[PDB]
């Protein structure tokens, strides 16, 4: 009685990785909510 992710097809290959970081594992829940994000690429 709960959705479970089973498909991830985004990149065919991954070679010469230049960074990797994984946060701590958790559970995502599968009236609204607003998620705002600011992405800045500097220096």
């Amino acid at each position: 009685k709960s959705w479970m992710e089973s498909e991830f097809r985004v990149y065919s290959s991954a070679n010469n990785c230049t960074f990797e970081y994984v946060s701590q594992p958790f559970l995502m829940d599968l009236f609204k909510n607003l998620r705002e994000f600011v992405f800045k690429n500097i220096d």
Partner: protein
């Protein structure tokens, strides 16, 4: 050796003092840097070739 494994290490606190005193090393030679200075040095990336 022909397929030597390489691990990329970044974005972490390297513990040189504990690492160098963990096991028994029959050979330990550093070039361009002292083993005890690494605790005070910062680097962009590390490559561990085993």
């Amino acid at each position: 050796v022909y397929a030597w494994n390489r691990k990329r290490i970044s974005n972490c606190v390297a513990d040189y003092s504990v690492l160098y005193n963990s096991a028994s090393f029959s050979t330990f030679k550093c070039y361009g840097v002292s083993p005890t200075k690494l605790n005070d040095l910062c680097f962009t990336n590390v490559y561990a070739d085993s």
